[PDB]
Amino acid sequence: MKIDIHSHILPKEWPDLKKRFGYGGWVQLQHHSKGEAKLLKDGKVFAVVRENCWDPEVRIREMDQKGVTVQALSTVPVMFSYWAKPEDTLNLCQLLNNDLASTVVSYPRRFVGLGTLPMQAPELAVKEMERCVKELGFPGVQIGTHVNEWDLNAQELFPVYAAAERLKCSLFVHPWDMQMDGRMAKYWLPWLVGMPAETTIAICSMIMGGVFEKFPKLKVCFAHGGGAFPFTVGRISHGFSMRPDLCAQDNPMNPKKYLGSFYTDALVHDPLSLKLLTDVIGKDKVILGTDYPFPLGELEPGKLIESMEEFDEETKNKLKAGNALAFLGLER
């Protein structure tokens, strides 16, 4: 019900990428029947999306109706494409970022853009970041919770962080590329459980990798209330204290010292979790985020926030829009 930091969109169409690049494993969007499109990844329909996933005029009507003022638009994490050749992911990121830039310029009072990067190639990612910031005007980018066998602690990724820091370019971290098969194939576990564990790992990798210590001005927001982190910080903090040989090897400060140093969205569904999220992360560091237009997201944006009896107005306004603005470096 003011700013939604967490929302995904696709271009309506893009060229056959297998043809474009020479190898398969990409996703396309097919428009078969009305107000619906199939996402495929070699072979199968991966997911069905409705027109709010591509048509910004539809997004505006839904936003008007829900009282959402601005959505920060980012691609669908399936498009990250960190597994492809570096130049080809770059080519794709340019197409998705421009398309994103084009939607934003059409409604620059209702949308901001969070771009995508070829993270598997930190020199290309820096360049594409500069362009997103300087040429495209995006306040930030969305990145995966990991990049192939790299976690957010990886040294290779360090230039990317120094660039983001320097460019005043915010990072929205989104869990992606969990295990989808084996034990994880049933009960939508990769989404229910594997996503919040991915995020929990990412936060851990960034704290214990020293990322926040190297780059104290890096602005970073994690997805879904930081996964399990706000609840298991005790275990993480105490275990860090207990086994510095395994945990304090790169950054000697206890994880608990970085509570306050990063943001999460507020997408945790119940009041008790939200209250704990703010207690643990702080009321300046939690941002309304919705996962629009996906069904695992908040159906009525901001409704969980508005219903918290304990929060005064100032707090509610922080969580709905204020914190978003600090995290993006923009003005109301």
Binds its own copies (CB under 8 A): choice among 55, 191, 215, 317:
191
In whole angstroms, the minimum distance from the beta carbon of 237 to Zn ion comes to: 18
Whether 145 contacts 194, CB under 8 Å? no
By DSSP bridging, strand 146-147 and strand 286-287 are: unpaired
> By CB under 8 A, is residue 238 in contact with its own copies?
yes
From CA 313, how far away is CA 274, in angstroms rounded?
16
In whole angstroms, the minimum distance from the beta carbon of 313 to Zn ion comes to: 28
> By CB under 8 A, is residue 301 in contact with its own copies?
no
From CA 174, how far away is CA 90, in angstroms rounded?
19
The nearer residue to Zn ion, 52 or 251, going by C-beta atoms, is: 52
In whole angstroms, the minimum distance from the beta carbon of 48 to its own copies comes to: 11
> By CB under 8 A, is residue 23 in contact with its own copies?
no
In whole angstroms, the minimum distance from the beta carbon of 99 to its own copies comes to: 28
The nearer residue to Zn ion, 70 or 126, going by C-beta atoms, is: 70
Angle between helices 229-242 and 195-208 (to 10 degrees): 40
| Number of shown-chain residues binding its own copies (CB under 8 A) | 50
Binds its own copies (CB under 8 A): choice among 52, 97, 200, 323:
200
> By CB under 8 A, is residue 201 in contact with its own copies?
yes
Among Zn ion, its own copies, none, the one that 95 touches (CB under a kind-dependent 5 to 8 A) is none
Task: Report residue 280 as tokens.
Answer: 């643990």
DSSP letter at 292? B
Q: Which residue's structure tokens are 């914190």? A: 323
The nearer residue to Zn ion, 175 or 230, going by C-beta atoms, is: 175
The nearer residue to its own copies, 181 or 313, going by C-beta atoms, is: 181
Binds its own copies (CB under 8 A): choice among 73, 280, 287, 288:
280
Residue by residue, what is the 3-state secondary structure of 106-171?
HCCCCEEEEECCCCCCHHHHHHHHHHHHHCCCCCEEEEECEECCEECCCHHHHHHHHHHHHHCCEE
From CA 239, how far away is CA 125, in angstroms rounded?
34
Among Zn ion, its own copies, none, the one that 142 touches (CB under a kind-dependent 5 to 8 A) is none
Binds Zn ion (CB under 5 A): choice among 151, 177, 198, 291:
291
Task: Report residue 219 as tokens.
Answer: 């602005």
Among Zn ion, its own copies, none, the one that 291 touches (CB under a kind-dependent 5 to 8 A) is Zn ion
Going residue by residue from 205 to 234, which x/- string records binding to its own copies, judged by CB under 8 A? x--x---------------xx-xx-xxxxx
Q: Which residues make Cβ contacts (< 8 Å) with residue 170, sequence separation at least 6?
A: 114, 139, 140, 141, 164, 219, 220, 221, 327, 328, 329
C-alpha Rg value of the chain to the nearest Å: 19
- Name the nearest CA neighbour of 49 among 79, 19, 71: 79
Binds its own copies (CB under 8 A): choice among 1, 197, 287, 288:
197
Q: Report the interface residues with Zn ion, using CB under 5 A.
A: 291
